Ligand binder design. Sequence first.
Ligand SMILES: O=C1NCC=CCN1[C@@H]1O[C@H](CO)[C@@H](O)[C@H]1O
Ligand SMILES: O=C1NCC=CCN1[C@@H]1O[C@H](CO)[C@@H](O)[C@H]1O
Ligand SMILES: O=C1NCC=CCN1[C@@H]1O[C@H](CO)[C@@H](O)[C@H]1O
Ligand SMILES: O=C1NCC=CCN1[C@@H]1O[C@H](CO)[C@@H](O)[C@H]1O
Ligand SMILES: [Zn+2]
Ligand SMILES: [Zn+2]
Ligand SMILES: [Zn+2]
Ligand SMILES: [Zn+2]
Lengths: 130, 130, 130, 130
Amino acid sequence: ECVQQLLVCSQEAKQSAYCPYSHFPVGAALLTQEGRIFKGCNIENACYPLGICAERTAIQKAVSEGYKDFRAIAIASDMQDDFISPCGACRQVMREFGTNWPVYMTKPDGTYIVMTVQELLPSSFGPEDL
Amino acid sequence: ECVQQLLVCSQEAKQSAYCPYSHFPVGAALLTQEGRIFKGCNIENACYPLGICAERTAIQKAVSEGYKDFRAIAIASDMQDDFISPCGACRQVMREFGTNWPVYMTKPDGTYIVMTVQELLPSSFGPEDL
Amino acid sequence: ECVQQLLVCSQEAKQSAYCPYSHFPVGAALLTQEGRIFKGCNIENACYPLGICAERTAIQKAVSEGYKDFRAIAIASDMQDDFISPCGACRQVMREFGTNWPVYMTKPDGTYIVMTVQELLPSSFGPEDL
Amino acid sequence: ECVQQLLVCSQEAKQSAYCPYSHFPVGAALLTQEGRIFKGCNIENACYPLGICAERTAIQKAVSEGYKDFRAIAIASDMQDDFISPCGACRQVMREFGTNWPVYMTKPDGTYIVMTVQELLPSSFGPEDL
Ligand SMILES: O=C1NCC=CCN1[C@@H]1O[C@H](CO)[C@@H](O)[C@H]1O
Ligand SMILES: O=C1NCC=CCN1[C@@H]1O[C@H](CO)[C@@H](O)[C@H]1O
Ligand SMILES: O=C1NCC=CCN1[C@@H]1O[C@H](CO)[C@@H](O)[C@H]1O
Ligand SMILES: O=C1NCC=CCN1[C@@H]1O[C@H](CO)[C@@H](O)[C@H]1O
Ligand SMILES: [Zn+2]
Ligand SMILES: [Zn+2]
Ligand SMILES: [Zn+2]
Ligand SMILES: [Zn+2]
């Protein structure tokens, strides 16, 4: 039941969210095999397209530290009627570093649904096709 | 058996591909409900991130023409041992305009596997969560 | 080939804008050497990072159609105070296909200011750097 | 706070670069007002459009950590002929957090050229335009 640890960490991360345009804060906490946890939030830009997601910010922070072996990730948002699910782009970056690790799509209260990168990105495009 | 029509159109589209960096040409042919077909290819940039996929180029061309109701899309590449599958990002743009339409992931010879946007992007993030 | 054409064409292009999130419509009119014009608009996505600008939509349309020349491009917005300037990303895609050509930053007023791709993105990163 | 620190720190950052596709490593060292430095590298993806630059990786790391100030940033590459300049997209993300601060474009030589965010992206699009 260490999932609990991640969830709180992703809600903490959500606090540093820079989303002045959508006002839709998002946080994520990435867990490596080593046991270290990397936090990330969405970072928008006046030119919407140049923004970045919370999952991407965590993965990129971890990869820049040398951690490329992930065990799981938890996403948090202020949405109530829906679990917070990663977008196609984020699912593609996750895929770059793993196919069988769990993604925790939470709700503000602590409830969540879990799916692996493969389940989220079936018949995925990947490194091997290049 | 009009799928044939799309496939050829996506291979035609693949010819205008501007991929000097990956040398990995990709074409796509989008079919609207009206029956019109929109072609697209990947367009790279020295700064890799600024590039764009073939599916995205077709959808964006169609949307800029007022077509937002899609019936199907076909992707073509020069890859042999794998069907050409859309990346997470492209699956997210498709989702923006439809959840139940077919995506034709072809092979150079004409063989292919088909899946809907939903199957490709399960538990998807979408407009409604905003 | 002529300014007026670009002013009205980029203005019409703005009409197809798919921007339910920003409510900030943008249009683009890319004039090729041949004399053909390509219209483009901003096309947003529920996941902000996956939207795309009017200029890129226009350029991508052109390239996918075989045109990589470009004599000029005009941008338009519903912004009455100040001319819409392209975002750094667009300047970067513009540069991939030339650094001298003009970019017409306009106002609904019909009034405009013009700057070359090179002036918009000085000491730029490009294909030569490989 | 000091040039030398940024030159070596951006150089180390380049070591974590995940660039199996371009084989073009890039490092970034963002100096915050506080005096803390954030390293970043380019992190590519099988789908080129989904990679991310060293500067954005560095900036995003910082912001997610609460820092939105920035006193300067240095870029580094294995490019011995010419200083690496940031791509338009990076300049655009840089601008979102200030337009005056310096950008140190370097050479493995230790030699460099410096230009402000504003000089790199003149007559820029920004948050004020909403
Ligand atoms: O970080 C995200 N992760 C989860 C789900 C959707 C996309 N987002 C962010 O939500 C905002 C609305 O698109 C924008 O800041 C995205 O980066
Ligand atoms: O258009 C694509 N569609 C299908 C599958 C993967 C991603 N690509 C392109 O393949 C190249 C390698 O990433 C790059 O130009 C992408 O835009
Ligand atoms: O097309 C654009 N071109 C010029 C100027 C700004 C960036 N945009 C669009 O404006 C909206 C605000 O970021 C978003 O839909 C962008 O695609
Ligand atoms: O990090 C970068 N910063 C500065 C200069 C160019 C763009 N890049 C990276 O160089 C590679 C070539 O486009 C790709 O991995 C980009 O992310
Ligand atoms: Zn995402
Ligand atoms: Zn794609
Ligand atoms: Zn733009
Ligand atoms: Zn960059």
